[PDB]
Write a structure and sequence with these properties.
part of a larger assembly; 9 chains; A alpha+beta (244); B alpha+beta (231); C alpha+beta (195); D alpha+beta (250); E alpha+beta (240); F alpha+beta (241); G alpha+beta (111); H alpha+beta (235); I alpha+beta (243); G: 111 residues; alpha+beta; 3-stranded antiparallel sheet; two-stranded antiparallel sheet; 2 helices; globular; I: 243 residues; Glutamine Phosphoribosylpyrophosphate, subunit 1, domain 1; 5-stranded antiparallel sheet; 24% strand; Proteasome subunit beta type-6 (chain G); proteasome (chain I); Probable proteasome subunit alpha type-7 (chain I); cytoplasm (chain I)
Chain lengths: 244, 231, 195, 250, 240, 241, 111, 235, 243
C-alpha cells in the first residue's frame, strides 16, 4: 500500500531530535531577518524584506508584519503562506477570548495556543510542520509590554530583545552589546535599524527593503497604539538616525 | 522476496506469499484428522503442551449442536473464525428456524478469509480448520485453509506430518466410509489414521482429543479419562 | 431553591440565600448552602430546577478553578460573569437547558470595587447595586429602591438585608427557613454565622 | 480503497528546501510566458495562446479568466491546474465573501483565498502542490487597481509590473526600463504587446495573443439598465480585432 | 486520520521510538527532587547560553497541577505543556466527581498512562519528556515524590533526578542521602538539593531554580537571593 | 525514484505517471478521427478483431453518452468503459439539476477536471485514455472536444488520435489549408462520413472492408453509430468515384 | 396512530417445593374477544433445568424467551459448558429487560 | 519498512515474535499451583537504591478470587489489568456470580491480537493469571501477547525463566502444600536473581479460596526468607 | 525501477504489472470454457481430483447469479466467489429497482466496472481470475469472458486457465464447422470433448467434468446444472473422441 511513500514527519532521530523541525529551522535561517526590541515605554518590531525587485508595489504590501489584535502584533520569518494560516487562527482565538470573557486576551495565552498548534504538527497527524518563526510584540495590563518568539518545535520564550531568520547569531551579539534595561522606544528604534544595517546581506539598507512597527503608549493616557510605518515614515526614520 | 511485504501484492509468477506464509503456520501446527461414514463424522486431534507442567492446547471447538471443527495453526485465529461460525449457525436458527448446512458454513468461511487476502493492512488467517457436521443431507467433513479454499472430503488431515494419516485414509477409504451405525469403530479408524503421523511420541490420556457428530448424536467432545477407551 | 438576593455596598458584596430544600409537601433540609466559591474573591449563588442548579454551579466552579491554575491568576468578576453568561446563553438552545438563575458577587482587586451581576437562565446579564431572583424581587427591589444608598458600610448593608428578609418572612407564602449570608470584599469571602 | 495517503507529500529536506514546491516552480519556469502591467487608470494582463495543434480552436481555450466582474487572472505552468484553481477561486469569492457581505471581495483578499488553497496543497495529506503561478489583476473601491503574483508555495506579492514563466527574466528587465508611475492604460497595453513579442517565436497577432484589462466600468456589458449605482464589469477581454488594431501602431 | 504505527518492536524486542524519546530527555536540562522529613524540594538547571531572557514571563520549569501538587520535567518543553494541561484538567475533574483532590500517586498514574498510550497508538510519537511529580496527599503530611518516563513506567523515589548529567547527580544523591535519616528541615533539604545541582551546573547564578512544597497546599518559589545564599554558604564550607 | 510511481513532481517539474498514462493510450493500436460537417459531426475509428472466437458486435470503442453526445476512446477498454459510465452519469445528473442537455464542451471540461484530480491526488491513478466528445451543440453547432490523462482539453476543427495520429493530423491540416474553411462543406452526413473515411485511407495508406471501421455520427438531437451495412453502403459510394 | 403493543391474555403460575418447582400456564391465546388458539404453549424448557414464561404481549414474550434461550447457549460457549444457575439466569434476565427500559417488553415474566 | 501485521516466511507474526524478546528482558515472575492455593512471586529489580521499592507493583489484584503477576514492558499491562477488572466486575453484575479464571484469561487474551493498521503494536508484557473458581479449582495461566494462554502447574517468565522452568520441572509434584510452594518460589527466585534476595526486592502473594488474593507484607516474606536459609543450611 | 510492486502504478511502457501478474495466477488455474449456442450458452470446467478423498460431485465450482446467469472461473477460487457475490448484489439491486431481471450485457459491465475498480488504487489487489459467464435475456443468448484488468467482450466461444490454447483451437474449429449455429444439446457434448482434450496440459492428476447451461428451449431460459443421464451421455461422447 501507501506506507512506501510516507516520510514519517513526526519521528525522533537516534539522537532524539525531530528531523523535520530541525530542517524547518534551517529553512527559516535563510529568511529575512526580523528583530524585536522591548523598551520600558514600548516595543519595536523591524524586519528586512526578501530581496525586493524595483517593480514591487512597496506600500500596499505586508510580508513580514501582521496585526493579531489591537494590542498584539507579530513579525514573521519563514514561509509567508504558512504564517497566514497560523495568523488567522491567532486572530480568531483572540476574538473567542474577548467574546467569552469581555477582556482582550493576555499576550502569553495567545502565544501559548499558537505554540500548542505548532507542537501538534510535530507529534501526531503525519503532516509537515509549519516553516515559520514568530516574534510576538504586545501589551496587556498584567505584564505590560512583552516580546515572545515561537518556532516550528512549538517552543516559545520571552525576550528583552531577540531576532529570527537570517544572521541571528550576528544580530543577537550586537543586541546583547548595546541593549540596556532603562532604554526608551526611540533608542530601541535606533538600535533595531543599526543592528539590521550591520547584519543585512545587502549593500546598504533602504526604506524599500524594510517593514517597521511600534507598540507605544503614545496616544492619550494609559492606552496603547499600534503603528505600522508607511514607506515614507521608514525613509524618514532612516534619515533621522543617519543611516542614509 | 520483494513481493511478500503484504497480501495486496502478487509475485511475477502470480503467487501470494503472505498467504503462503500463513499456510506455513498450519504446517507447524499439531496434527489433526477428520473422517466420516454416512451416519457420523469424527475429528481426532493431537494436542500439544508447552512443557511437562502445562496444559494441552484445545484443538476442537463446538459451533452448534450439529457442527464443530478442529484447528491447526494460530489458535486465536481459530477462535475468531469459530466464533463467526457460531454466529452464522445462530443467525440461521433465530431467523429461519433452520440448521445451517455444512456446505454453506464452508462458503461463508471461504468468503471471510478471502477479504483478508485482497486489502491493505489486514493479514490472512494463520490457521487451518476441519469442519464436521450432520445436517439435512447427512454427515460432512470440510477442510478450510486461509487462502479461502474450502473442500468437502470423506476424510483428511492437516498439521505437522499430516501426510501419513492422509495416505492411510486414502488407503482405508472404502472401509471406513461404511462404518455406519457404529460410533466407536469410526473413532478407532480415526485414532489409527492419526497414529501414522506420530513420531517419538504416542497417544496418552491427556494428549488425545476426539469429537463426534451424527444421526442421533450431538457434536460432543471427549478428553481426559473418556478417551482412555481408545488408546 | 427560591430566595437569592445580593446587595453591593461601598466596599463589599453581600449575598443572601434561603436555606430550605423542598420536594412535594416535605422540607427535606433547612440548612442548605446555595452558593459556590468560584475564586477567592468571587462567589456565586444559584436557584432554579432541582439537580440543574448544583450541577451547573459545580461545573462553573471547576472551569474557573482550572483557569486559575493554568494562568496562576484570578479572573476579574466581570470576566467570570461573562463566562457564565455565555454558558447559560449556549444552554438555552441546547437539547435540555440548564434552568438556573445566578447572582455573581465579586471584589475586583485591580479596580478595588465590589461588583454584583444578576444572570437568569436565558443568559440575561446585568450589573446592579442590588439584585434578586424569583418572586423575592417583587418585594425587595422597591424596598431597596427606597432604603438603599450607594455609599453604605458593610454593617449598613447587613441591616438593609435584615429589612429584606423581614419583609419576605412577613409576606411570602412559603417558609424558606431563613438565609445564609456571605460577604465578599478585598480580603475574600466570609460567612456571617448569626442571621 | 479510499485515500490511505493522509501524510504530507511535501516535506523539508535537510537543507531546508521544500522539494515539491521547488519542482513545481520548475514546472512554472517551463510554462509559456505571461505578464501584467499596472497603469494609473487600469491594469493589463497578457499571455501567448500557444496552440497544441492548428486543428485546435484556441478561442475555446481561455488562458485569461474572469474571477469577479472586477478581477481577472492569467497563469504560467500547467493549464489544467489553472482551470480548477479558477473554478475554486470563483466559488470562494461567493461562499466566503459575496454570500456574506452582498458585494464582491477586494483583490488582495480574493488573492489571499487562492493563496490559502495553494498553501494547503503544500501541506495536506496525499497531494502535490499546484504547478502554476498566477497573476491576478483587479479593482476595488477602497484600494483602486492592483496586481498580484501567487506562487505554488501560496506566497503572493503585489507588483507594479512583472512577468512569469519561460522568458520572464528578460521580460522583467524590459518592463523595468519602460515602467513609470504615470502610465495611462493604453500605454501599458502597448508596453505589454512589446514585451510579449520578445518571448514569442511564431505568429504574433490577435489570434495568438490573449489580453485582458481591468479598466473603466462597462455599462454596455452589464446586461440590464435601471439601477444607476450598478455600472458594470471593469474586466474586459480584448477582441482579436482590438489587438490587431494596436499592433499596426506597434 | 493518520494511522501509521510509529512505535513498533524491533528484532531485539526494543521499541526504538520510546528509546529515542529517552534520548531527548537526556538532552534536556537537569531536574532533581529530594524529599525531606516533612517537605519535598524540586530543583532545576536553567541552560546558561541565554542572556537577554525576560524571566518575568519565560515559562518556569516547575508547574502547579493543583494547589498541593507540582510537576517538573526534562526533555522537550512543548511536549511537556500537553502533559501538564491534561494533568490539570484531570485534577479538577477528580475534585468534581470524587469531592477530594488527587493523591500524588493518582495524578502520577494518570500522567504515566497518557505517556504509555502514546507508545501504542497509531499516528503519534511518544512524549520526549520525563517528569518528577511531588506534593502531599490531602489531609496527609507524609511527603511524596514520583518519576514518570516516556515508556509509561512510574515509581516512587526518596530522591531522584532526570535530564543531562543526571547520572552524575544521581551518583551524588546515592552517597549523600540517608534513607534512615531524611533532611529533617526545609533548610536541610533545600541545601542537599542545591549541592547535588552544583556538581553539574556551573555558577549557581540564575542557573538554578528551587521550589519547596510543604503540606496543605504550602508551595513557594525561592528567589535568586535565597538560593544564592545556599550557593555561597556551601562553597565556603567546601574550602577544607 | 518513488517520484515516478505516484503523481508528485520530479526534479524537472514533471509527472511521470501522467506521461506513462499517455503511453497506455496507444496500447490498443487503434487510430480515430473526427470531423465537422455543416449540420453534423462524424467520428471514425479503426475496428480490429484479432481473435476469431470474439463476438465482433461487442467490440467497440465508441459510446453513446447522452441522446446528443457521442464519445470515442483511445485506450484500454476497462479504463474506457470506466470513463464512459461516469460521463453517462454526469450527463444525466446535469440534465436533472439544470433542466437542459449537457453541452459537449462542458462534459469535456467536467471529465477533464476529474482527470486533473488524479494528477494531483496520490491515491487515484490517471486513466490510460483519451476521450473525444462529439455532438451538434444547440448553441455552438457541430463540436469536437478532446480530453487526455493530464486533464487537458480543447475544441477542435477536426482531430485524430492513436499511433498513426500525426499522419492523419497533417493530412487534415493540409485539407483545411486548401479548403480555406472550418469544416467539411457538405450537405449530408453521409458525404461527411465518406470524406472522413477517404482521408483516413490516404493518410494510413490502407483500404478498409465494412468490418475494419466503426462510425459514429452526431446530428441535431441525436448521436448514433452505423451498422456494418450502413458503412458498406458508404464504402461502395467511395469506390464508385 | 400505530400502537406497537397488544394483549394476548393467558395467565401463568409458579410454585416452589422443597426439592422441586412448577411453572404452569393456560394454553389459550386471545386478542380482544376472539380466540386465536386453544393450544399455544407459553411455558418453555430453556435448558440447564430452567423453565420460563413471559406472559402478556406474546410477540414480546416470544422475543424475550428466544433471547434468553440464546443467552444460555452463549453462556455454555463462553464459560466452558458451565451450568447456568437459576440466580444467575434471574440476573441475566433483568439486564435483558432493563436494556429495553424505554421501550419495554410488555410481559410479566416467571422462571 | 513493512506492515505491522506481516507474516514471516516461517509463518509467524514478526511483531509478536519481537515482543517475546522484550519479555525475556523483563524481571522474573514465578507461579505455582497447589491444592491449597496458588502462589505468585516476583523480582522487583529496583534500578537504583534510591527508588522506594514498595512502589514497585508487579503483582496485582484483578478480583477477590483472581490475581496477576507481570514481566516485560510493565507499563503495557496497566490497560490489560483495567480490562480484566472491568470484565470480572461486569460479569458479576450480569450474572450475580464469580467469573471463571479461564474465561477471565480468555477475555484478556482477546485484546492481544487487536493491533495493526485498534492499537498500533502488540503488548510487550506477559502475564501470570492465578485464581480459584468452583468448577475447576486453583488455576494458573500464562497469557502471552500472541493471544495464546496456557494453563500451568507451575511457570516462570522473564529473564531467569529457562533456568527456573527447569527447576520447577523437577520440584513440582501434585501434593505440594502452600508453605512448600512459597518456599519453592523464594528458592528459585534467589537462584536466578542478579542481586541477593531479601524482603525488599522480591514479593510474594497467594490466592486461596478461603481468603482470596493476598499480597504478603515484607515482614511475612522476611520470616519465609529466614525459614528458607534454615532449611538449606540444614542438609 | 520497482514499477511492479504496487497496484495501479503505470510502467514506462504504459502497463500495470500487478494486473499482468494476476493473469499469471489465472493461467496457473484449471481450464474452463463457455460455448454460445443457438438459443443459449454452455459452461464447463475441469476439476482436478487432488485425492481419492474428494467426495465426487460435491465440490461444485460453477455458480449461478439470479436465476438466468451462469458463472465459471479459472485462477484463485476464493477471488471468483467474491466476484460472484458482488454480481449477485448487483443483479438483486437491478431487479429491485427495474423489476425485470438483469440483461446479460448490463450484468457484464457491472462485473467489469467492479473488477476495473480494483486496478485503480494500491490499497487493493487485482482479481486473480478470468471469468466466463452468460445467459439468456429478452434479446437472446450472450457469452462473456472477463479478465483481471476488467477487460471483457462477448464471445462465440471462450476458454481460460492452463488448457486455454488447446481449448481455443478446438473452439475455433467449432465456429468454423457450424456457421449456421450449434444446438444446446450438441454444445453440451462439445463442451465435454473440449474439456477432455484440454486436460492434456494438466494430466498428472485426473479430473471430474462439470457442465451447466441456459437454453430458451431446453431449460426455459434458466440456469441448470447438467446431471445424470445427460452428463454421462456427454462424458461418453468425449471418451470416444480421445481414442
Amino acid at each position: 500500500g501507501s506506507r512506501r511513500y510516507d516520510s514519517r514527519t513526526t519521528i525522533f532521530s537516534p539522537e532524539g531530535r525531530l528531523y523535520q523541525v530541525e530542517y524547518a529551522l534551517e529553512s527559516i535561517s535563510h529568511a529575512g531577518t526580523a528583530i524585536g526590541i522591548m523598551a520600558s515605554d514600548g516595543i519595536v518590531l523591524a524586519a528586512e524584506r526578501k530581496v525586493t525587485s524595483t517593480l514591487l508595489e512597496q506600500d500596499t504590501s505586508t510580508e513580514k508584519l501582521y496585526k493579531l489584535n489591537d494590542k498584539i502584533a507579530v513579525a514573521v520569518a519563514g514561509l509567508t503562506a504558512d504564517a497566514e494560516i497560523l495568523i488567522n487562527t491567532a486572530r480568531i482565538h483572540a476574538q473567542n477570548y474577548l467574546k467569552t470573557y469581555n477582556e482582550d486576551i493576555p499576550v502569553e495565552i495567545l502565544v501559548r495556543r499558537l505554540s500548542d498548534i505548532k507542537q501538534g504538527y510535530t507529534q501526531h497527524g503525519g503532516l509537515r510542520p509549519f516553516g515559520v518563526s514568530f516574534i510576538y510584540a504586545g501589551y496587556d495590563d498584567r505584564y505590560g509590554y512583552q516580546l515572545y518568539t515561537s518556532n516550528p518545535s512549538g517552543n516559545y520564550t520571552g525576550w528583552k530583545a531577540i531576532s529570527v531568520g537570517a544572521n541571528t547569531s550576528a544580530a543577537q551579539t550586537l543586541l546583547q552589546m548595546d541593549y540596556k534595561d532603562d532604554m526608551k522606544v526611540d533608542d530601541a528604534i535606533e538600535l533595531a535599524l543599526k543592528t539590521l544595517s550591520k547584519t543585512t546581506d545587502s549593500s546598504a539598507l533602504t526604506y524599500d527593503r524594510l517593514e517597521f512597527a511600534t507598540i507605544r503608549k503614545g496616544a492619550n493616557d494609559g492606552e496603547v497604539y499600534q503603528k505600522i510605518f508607511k514607506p515614507q515614515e521608514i525613509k524618514d526614520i532612516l534619515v533621522k538616525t543617519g543611516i542614509t | 522476496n520483494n513481493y511478500d511485504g503484504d497480501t495486496v501484492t502478487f509475485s511475477p509468477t502470480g503467487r501470494l506469499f503472505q498467504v503462503e506464509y500463513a499456510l506455513e503456520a498450519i504446517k507447524q501446527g499439531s496434527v489433526t484428522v477428520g473422517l466420516r461414514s454416512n451416519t457420523h463424522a469424527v475429528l481426532v486431534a493431537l494436542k500439544r503442551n508447552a512443557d511437562e507442567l502445562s496444559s494441552y492446547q484445545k484443538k476442537i471447538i463446538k459451533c452448534d449442536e450439529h457442527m464443530g471443527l478442529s484447528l491447526a495453526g494460530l489458535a486465536p485465529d481459530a477462535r475468531v473464525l469459530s466464533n463467526y461460525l457460531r454466529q452464522q449457525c445462530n443467525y440461521s436458527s433465530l431467523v429461519f428456524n433452520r440448521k445451517l448446512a455444512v456446505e454453506r458454513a464452508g462458503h461463508l468461511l471461504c468468503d471471510k478469509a478471502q477479504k483478508n487476502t485482497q486489502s491493505y493492512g489486514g493479514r490472512p488467517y494463520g490457521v487451518g480448520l476441519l469442519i464436521i457436521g450432520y445436517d439435512k443431507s447427512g454427515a460432512h467433513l470440510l477442510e478450510f485453509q486461509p487462502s479461502g479454499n474450502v473442500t468437502e472430503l470423506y476424510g483428511t488431515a492437516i498439521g505437522a506430518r499430516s501426510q501419513g494419516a492422509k495416505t492411510y485414509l486414502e488407503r482405508t477409504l472404502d472401509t471406513f466410509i461404511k462404518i455406519d451405525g457404529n460410533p466407536d469403530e469410526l473413532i478407532k479408524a480415526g485414532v489409527e489414521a492419526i497414529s501414522q503421523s506420530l513420531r517419538d511420541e504416542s497417544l496418552t490420556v491427556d494428549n488425545l482429543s476426539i469429537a463426534i457428530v451424527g444421526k442421533d448424536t450431538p457434536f460432543t467432545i471427549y478428553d481426559g479419562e473418556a478417551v482412555a477407551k481408545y488408546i | 431553591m427560591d430566595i437569592i438576593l445580593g446587595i453591593r455596598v461601598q466596599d463589599s458584596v453581600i449575598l443572601a440565600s434561603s436555606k430550605a430544600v423542598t420536594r412535594g409537601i416535605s422540607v427535606l433540609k433547612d440548612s442548605d448552602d446555595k452558593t459556590r466559591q468560584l475564586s477567592p474573591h468571587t462567589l456565586m449563588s444559584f436557584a432554579g430546577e432541582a439537580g440543574d442548579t448544583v450541577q451547573f454551579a459545580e461545573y462553573i466552579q471547576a472551569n474557573i478553578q482550572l483557569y486559575s491554575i493554568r494562568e496562576d491568576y484570578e479572573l476579574s468578576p466581570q470576566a467570570v460573569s461573562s463566562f457564565v453568561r455565555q454558558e447559560l446563553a449556549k444552554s438555552i438552545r441546547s437539547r435540555r437547558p440548564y434552568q438556573v438563575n445566578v447572582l455573581i458577587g465579586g471584589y475586583d482587586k485591580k479596580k478595588n470595587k465590589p461588583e454584583l451581576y444578576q444572570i437568569d437562565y436565558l443568559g440575561t446579564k446585568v450589573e446592579l447595586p442590588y439584585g434578586a431572583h424569583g418572586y423575592s424581587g417583587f418585594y425587595t427591589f422597591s424596598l431597596l429602591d427606597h432604603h438603599y444608598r450607594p455609599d453604605m458600610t458593610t454593617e449598613e448593608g447587613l441591616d438593609l438585608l435584615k429589612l429584606c428578609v423581614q419583609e419576605l418572612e412577613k409576606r411570602m407564602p412559603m417558609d424558606f427557613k431563613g438565609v445564609i449570608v456571605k460577604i465578599v470584599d478585598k480580603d475574600g469571602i466570609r460567612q456571617v454565622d448569626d442571621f | 480503497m479510499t485515500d490511505r495517503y493522509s501524510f504530507s507529500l511535501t516535506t523539508f529536506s535537510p537543507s531546508g528546501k521544500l522539494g515539491q514546491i521547488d519542482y513545481a516552480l520548475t514546472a512554472v519556469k517551463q510554462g509559456v510566458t505571461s505578464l501584467g502591467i499596472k497603469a494609473t487608470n487600469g491594469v493589463v494582463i497578457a499571455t501567448e495562446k500557444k496552440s497544441s495543434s492548428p486543428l485546435a480552436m484556441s478561442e475555446t481555450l481561455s488562458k485569461v479568466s474572469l474571477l469577479t466582474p472586477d478581477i481577472g487572472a492569467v497563469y504560467s505552468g500547467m493549464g489544467p491546474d489553472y482551470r480548477v484553481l479558477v473554478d475554486k477561486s470563483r466559488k470562494v469569492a461567493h461562499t466566503s465573501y459575496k454570500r456574506i457581505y452582498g458585494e464582491y471581495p477586494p483583490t488582495k483578499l480574493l488573492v489571499s483565498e487562492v493563496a490559502k488553497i495553494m498553501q494547503e496543497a503544500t501541506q495536506s495529506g496525499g497531494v502535490r502542490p499546484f504547478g502554476v503561478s498566477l497573476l491576478i489583476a483587479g479593482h476595488d473601491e477602497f484600494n483602486g487597481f492592483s496586481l498580484y503574483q501567487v506562487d505554488p508555495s501560496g506566497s503572493y506579492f503585489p507588483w507594479k509590473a512583472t512577468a512569469i514563466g519561460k522568458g520572464s527574466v528578460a521580460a522583467k528587465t524590459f518592463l523595468e526600463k519602460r515602467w513609470n508611475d504615470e502610465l495611462e492604460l493604453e500605454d501599458a497595453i502597448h508596453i505589454a504587446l512589446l514585451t510579449l513579442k520578445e518571448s514569442v517565436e511564431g505568429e504574433f497577432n490577435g489570434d495568438t495573443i490573449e489580453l485582458a484589462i481591468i479598466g473603466d466600468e462597462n455599462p454596455d456589458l452589464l446586461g440590464y439598465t435601471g439601477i444607476p449605482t450598478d455600472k458594470g464589469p471593469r474586466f474586459r477581454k480584448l477582441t482579436s480585432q482590438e489587438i490587431n488594431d494596436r499592433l499596426e501602431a506597434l | 486520520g493518520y494511522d501509521r504505527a510509529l512505535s513498533i518492536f524491533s528484532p531485539d524486542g526494543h521499541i526504538f521510538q520510546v528509546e529515542y524519546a529517552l534520548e531527548a530527555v537526556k538532552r534536556g536540562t537537569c531536574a532533581v527532587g529530594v524529599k525531606g522529613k516533612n517537605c519535598v524540594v524540586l530543583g532545576c538547571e536553567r541552560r546558561s547560553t541565554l542572556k537577554l531572557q525576560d524571566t518575568r514571563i519565560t515559562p518556569s520549569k516547575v508547574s502547579k497541577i493543583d494547589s498541593h501538587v507540582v510537576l517538573s520535567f526534562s526533555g522537550l518543553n512543548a511536549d511537556s505543556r500537553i502533559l501538564i494541561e491534561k494533568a490539570r484538567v484531570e485534577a479538577q475533574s477528580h475534585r468534581l466527581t470524587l469531592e477530594d483532590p488527587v493523591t500524588v500517586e493518582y495524578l502520577t498514574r494518570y500522567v504515566a498512562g497518557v505517556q504509555q498510550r502514546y507508545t501504542q497508538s497509531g499516528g503519534v510519537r511518544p512524549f520526549g519528556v520525563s517528569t518528577l511529580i511531588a506534593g502531599f496527599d490531602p489531609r496527609d503530611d507524609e511527603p511524596k515524590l514520583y518519576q514518570t518516563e516516556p515508556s509509561g513506567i512510574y515509581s516512587s523515589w526518596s530522591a531522584q533526578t532526570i535530564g543531562r548529567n543526571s547520572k552524575t547527580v544521581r551518583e551524588f544523591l546515592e552517597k549523600n542521602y540517608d534513607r534512615k535519616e531524611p533532611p529533617a528541615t526545609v533548610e536541610e533539604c533545600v541545601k542537599l538539593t542545591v549541592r547535588s545541582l552544583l556538581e553539574v551546573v556551573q555558577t549557581g547564578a540564575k542557573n538554578i531554580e528551587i521550589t519547596v512544597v510543604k503540606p496543605d497546599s504550602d508551595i513557594v518559589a525561592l528567589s535568586s537571593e535565597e538560593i544564592n545564599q545556599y550557593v555561597t554558604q556551601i562553597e565556603q564550607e567546601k574550602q577544607e | 525514484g518513488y517520484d515516478r510511481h505516484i503523481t508528485i513532481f520530479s526534479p524537472e517539474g514533471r509527472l511521470y505517471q501522467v506521461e506513462y498514462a499517455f503511453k497506455a493510450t496507444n496500447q490498443t493500436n487503434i487510430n480515430s478521427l473526427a470531423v465537422r460537417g455543416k449540420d453534423c459531426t462524424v467520428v471514425i475509428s479503426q475496428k480490429k478483431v484479432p481473435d476469431k472466437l470474439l463476438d465482433p458486435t461487442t467490440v467497440s470503442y465508441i459510446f453513446c453518452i447522452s441522446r446528443t453526445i457521442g464519445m470515442v476512446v483511445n485506450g484500454p477498454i476497462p479504463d474506457a468503459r470506466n470513463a464512459a459510465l461516469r460521463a453517462k452519469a454526469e450527463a444525466a445528473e446535469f440534465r436533472y439539476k439544470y433542466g437542459y442537455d449537457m453541452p459537449c464542451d462542458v462534459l469535456a471540461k467536467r471529465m477533464a477536471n476529474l482527470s486533473q484530480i488524479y494528477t494531483q491526488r496520490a491515491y487515484m491513478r490517471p486513466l490510460g485514455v483519451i476521450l473525444t466528445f462529439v455532438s451538434v451543440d444547440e448553441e455552438l453547432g457541430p463540436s469536437i472536444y478532446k480530453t487526455d490523462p493530464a486533464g487537458y482539453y480543447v475544441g477542435y476543427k477536426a482531430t485524430a488520435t492513436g499511433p498513426k495520429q500525426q499522419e492523419i493530423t497533417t493530412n487534415l491540416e493540409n485539407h483545411f489549408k486548401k479548403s480555406k474553411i472550418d469544416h467539411i462543406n457538405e450537405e449530408s452526413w453521409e458525404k461527411v462520413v465518406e470524406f472522413a473515411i477517404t482521408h483516413m485511407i490516404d493518410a494510413l495508406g490502407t483500404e478498409f472492408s465494412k468490418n475494419d471501421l466503426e462510425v459514429g455520427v452526431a446530428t441535431k438531437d441525436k448521436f448514433f453509430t452505423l451498422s456494418a451495412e450502413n458503412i458498406e453502403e458508404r464504402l461502395v459510394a467511395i469506390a464508385e468515384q | 396512530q400505530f400502537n406497537p403493543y397488544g394483549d394476548n391474555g393467558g395467565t401463568i403460575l409458579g410454585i416452589a417445593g422443597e426439592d422441586f418447582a412448577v411453572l404452569a400456564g393456560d394454553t389459550r391465546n386471545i386478542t380482544d374477544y376472539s380466540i386465536n388458539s386453544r393450544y399455544e404453549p407459553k411455558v418453555f424448557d430453556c435448558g440447564d433445568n430452567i423453565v420460563m414464561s413471559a406472559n402478556g404481549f406474546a410477540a414480546d414474550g416470544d422475543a424475550l424467551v428466544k433471547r434468553f434461550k440464546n443467552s444460555v447457549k452463549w453462556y455454555h460457549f463462553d464459560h466452558n459448558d458451565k451450568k447456568l444457575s437459576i440466580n444467575s439466569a434471574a440476573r441475566n434476565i433483568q439486564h435483558l429487560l432493563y436494556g429495553k427500559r424505554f421501550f419495554p417488553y410488555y410481559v410479566h415474566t416467571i422462571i | 519498512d513493512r506492515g505491522v501485521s506481516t507474516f514471516s516466511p516461517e509463518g509467524r507474526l514478526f511483531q509478536v515474535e519481537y515482543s517475546l524478546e522484550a519479555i525475556k528482558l523483563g524481571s522474573t515472575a514465578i507461579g505455582i499451583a497447589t491444592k491449597e492455593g496458588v502462589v505468585l512471586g516476583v523480582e522487583k529489580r529496583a534500578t537504583s537504591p534510591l527508588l522506594e521499592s514498595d512502589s514497585i507493583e508487579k503483582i496485582v489484584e484483578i478480583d477477590r478470587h483472581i490475581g496477576c503477576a507481570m514481566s516485560g514492558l510493565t507499563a503495557d499491562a496497566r490497560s490489560m489489568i483495567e480490562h480484566a477488572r472491568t470484565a470480572a466486575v461486569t460479569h458479576n453484575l450480569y450474572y450475580d456470580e464469580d467469573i471463571n479464571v479461564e474465561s477471565l484469561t480468555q477475555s484478556v487474551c482477546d485484546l492481544a491480537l487487536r493491533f495493526g493498521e485498534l492499537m498500533s503494536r502488540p503488548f510487550g508484557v506477559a502475564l501470570l493469571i492465578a485464581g480459584h473458581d468452583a468448577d475447576d479449582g486453583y488455576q494458573l495461566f500464562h497469557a502471552e501477547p500472541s493471544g495464546t494462554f496456557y494453563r500451568y502447574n507451575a511457570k516462570a517468565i522473564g529473564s531467569g525463566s529457562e533456568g527456573a522452568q527447569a527447576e520447577l520441572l523437577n520440584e513440582w509434584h501434585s501434593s505440594l502444600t502452600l508453605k512448600e510452594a512459597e518456599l519453592l518460589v523464594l528458592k528459585i527466585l534467589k537462584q536466578v536473581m542478579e542481586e541477593k534476595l531479601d524482603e525488599n526486592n522480591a514479593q510474594l502473594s497467594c490466592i486461596t479460596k478461603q481468603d482470596g488474593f493476598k499480597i504478603y507484607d515484607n515482614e511475612k516474606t522476611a520470616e519465609l526468607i529466614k525459614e528458607l536459609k534454615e532449611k538449606e543450611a540444614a542438609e | 525501477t520497482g514499477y511492479d510492486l504496487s497496484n495501479s502504478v503505470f510502467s514506462p511502457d504504459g502497463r500495470n504489472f500487478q494486473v499482468e501478474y494476476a493473469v499469471k495466477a489465472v493461467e496457473n488455474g484449471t481450464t474452463s470454457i463457455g460455448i454460445k449456442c443457438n438459443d443459449g450458452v454452455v459452461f464447463a470446467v475441469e476439476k482436478l481430483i487432488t485425492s481419492k478423498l474428494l467426495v465426487p460431485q460435491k465440490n461444485v465450482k460453477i455458480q449461478v447469479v439470479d436465476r438466468h446467469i451462469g458463472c465459471v472461473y479459472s485462477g484463485l477460487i476464493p477471488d471468483g466467489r467474491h466476484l460472484v457475490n458482488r454480481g449477485r448484489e448487483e443483479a438483486a439491486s437491478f431487479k429491485k429497482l427495474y423489476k425485470t431481471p438483469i440483461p446479460i450485457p448490463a450484468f457484464a459491465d457491472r462485473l467489469g466496472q467492479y473488477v476495473q475498480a480494483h486496478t485503480l488504487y494500491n490499497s487493493v489487489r487485482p482479481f486473480g481470475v478470468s471469468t466466463i459467464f452468460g445467459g439468456v435475456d429478452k434479446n437472446g443468448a450472450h457469452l462473456y469472458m472477463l479478465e483481471p484488468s476488467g477487460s471483457y467482450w462477448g464471445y462465440k466461444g471462450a476458454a481460460t486457465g492452463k488448457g486455454r490454447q488447446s481449448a481455443k483451437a478446438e473452439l475455433e474449429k467449432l465456429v468454423d464447422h457450424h456457421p449456421e449455429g450449434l444446438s444446446a444439446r450438441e454444445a453440451v457434448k462439445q463442451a465435454a470433448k473440449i474439456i477432455y482434450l484440454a486436460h492434456e496440459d494438466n494430466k498428472e492428476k485426473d479430473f471430474e467434468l462439470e457442465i451447466s447451461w441456459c437454453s430458451l428451449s431446453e431449460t426455459n431460459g434458466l440456469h441448470k446444472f447438467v446431471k445424470g443421464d445427460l452428463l454421462q451421455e456427454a462424458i461418453d461422447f468425449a471418451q470416444k473422441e480421445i481414442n
